[PDB]
């Protein structure tokens, strides 16, 4: 049967190319403890993007050690809704 | 984590059918994640706390119901034999979805290995993960959406400046 070759992926990073990604050594990686907590906050009402989309906004604001988790070759063709419990 | 209610599951599958991805019921589902991550270098910097995105992640991924495969402490060829390992695992067939974790040091165009350094470069490219995952070589998930999560540099340059590092804080 005929099928795509690359379709249902996406990818999220922690910062944009060429730039440095930070990590708290009593917390562990900045990036991966705000997916963690609004993925907590937002997997049972929120859409995978959306969740994505509160990550990145939580990082808008411009701090001293700044990191843009940026999402990447996306090929999402429908939204992807957890259902968490279910 | 709280739950989706299963009022809200079932007005969501009836109101967007066509514009969600399908999720199998969680009787005889095999979800199963990947957890890539590499602590210890043998000329890159320990990265400290990195335990502390492992159990985190782990357990994210287990409380949305996914079985999750950890692997630490692998070269690029290392992370790539492991990859399609588990990208052949026939539990993706009776799954809808799979997360994939990789937390390391990191290169402009892939992760490091173990084994990187200046003179001795071990990266895998992120290119070459799609092509492990893709609808060719993973017929497991094909029409089945494939999460990538990268905690990573993706250089060396600063990601802020002025327009007109502290003790417990490293860089990856």
Same mark, same amino acid.
């Given at each position: $049967?005929?099928?795509?070759?690359? $379709?249902?992926?996406?990818?999220?990073?922690?910062?944009?190319?060429?730039?440095?990604?930070?990590?708290?050594?009593?917390?562990?990686?900045?990036?991966?403890?705000?997916?963690?907590?609004?993925?907590?906050?937002?997997?049972?009402?929120?859409?995978?993007?959306?969740?994505?989309? $509160?990550?990145?906004?939580?990082?808008? $604001?411009?701090?001293?050690?700044?990191?843009?988790?940026?999402?990447?070759?996306?090929?999402?063709?429908?939204?992807?809704?957890?259902?968490?419990?279910? | 984590?709280?739950?989706?209610?299963?009022?809200?599951? #079932?007005? =969501?599958?009836?109101?967007?059918?066509?514009?969600?991805?399908?999720?199998?019921?969680?009787?005889?589902?095999?979800?199963?994640?990947?957890?890539?991550?590499?602590?210890?270098?043998?000329?890159?910097? &320990?990265?400290?706390?990195?335990?502390?995105?492992?159990?985190?992640?782990?357990? =994210?991924?287990?409380?949305?119901?996914?079985?999750?495969?950890?692997?630490?402490? =692998?070269?690029?060829?290392?992370?790539?034999?492991?990859?399609?390992?588990?990208?052949?695992?026939?539990?993706?067939?009776?799954?809808?979805?799979?997360?994939?974790?990789?937390?390391?040091?990191?290169? &402009?165009?892939?992760?490091?290995? #173990?084994?990187?350094?200046?003179?001795?470069?071990?990266?895998?490219?992120?290119?070459?993960?799609?092509?492990?995952?893709?609808?060719?070589?993973?017929?497991?998930?094909?029409?089945?959406?494939?999460?990538?999560?990268?905690?990573?540099?993706?250089?060396?340059?600063?990601?802020?400046?002025?327009?007109? &590092?502290?003790?417990?804080?490293?860089?990856?």
């Amino acid at each position: $049967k005929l099928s795509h070759v690359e $379709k249902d992926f996406i990818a999220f990073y922690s910062t944009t190319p060429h730039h440095l990604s930070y990590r708290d050594k009593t917390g562990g990686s900045y990036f991966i403890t705000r997916l963690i907590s609004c993925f907590r906050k937002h997997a049972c009402s929120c859409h995978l993007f959306d969740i994505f989309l $509160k990550v990145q906004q939580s990082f808008e $604001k411009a701090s001293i050690h700044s990191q843009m988790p940026t999402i990447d070759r996306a090929t999402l063709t429908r939204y992807f809704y957890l259902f968490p419990g279910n | 984590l709280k739950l989706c209610s299963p009022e809200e599951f #079932t007005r =969501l599958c009836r109101e967007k059918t066509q514009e969600i991805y399908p999720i199998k019921e969680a009787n005889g589902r095999t979800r199963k994640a990947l957890i890539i991550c590499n602590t210890e270098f043998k000329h890159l910097s &320990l990265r400290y706390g990195a335990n502390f995105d492992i159990i985190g992640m782990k357990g =994210l991924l287990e409380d949305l119901g996914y079985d999750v495969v950890v692997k630490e402490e =692998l070269t690029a060829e290392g992370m790539e034999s492991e990859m399609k390992d588990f990208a052949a695992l026939s539990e993706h067939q009776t799954s809808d979805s799979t997360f994939l974790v990789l937390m390391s040091h990191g290169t &402009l165009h892939g992760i490091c290995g #173990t084994m990187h350094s200046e003179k001795t470069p071990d990266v895998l490219q992120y290119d070459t993960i799609y092509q492990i995952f893709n609808n060719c070589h993973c017929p497991g998930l094909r029409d089945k959406p494939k999460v990538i999560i990268v905690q990573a540099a993706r250089g060396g340059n600063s990601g802020e400046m002025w327009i007109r &590092l502290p003790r417990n804080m490293e860089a990856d």
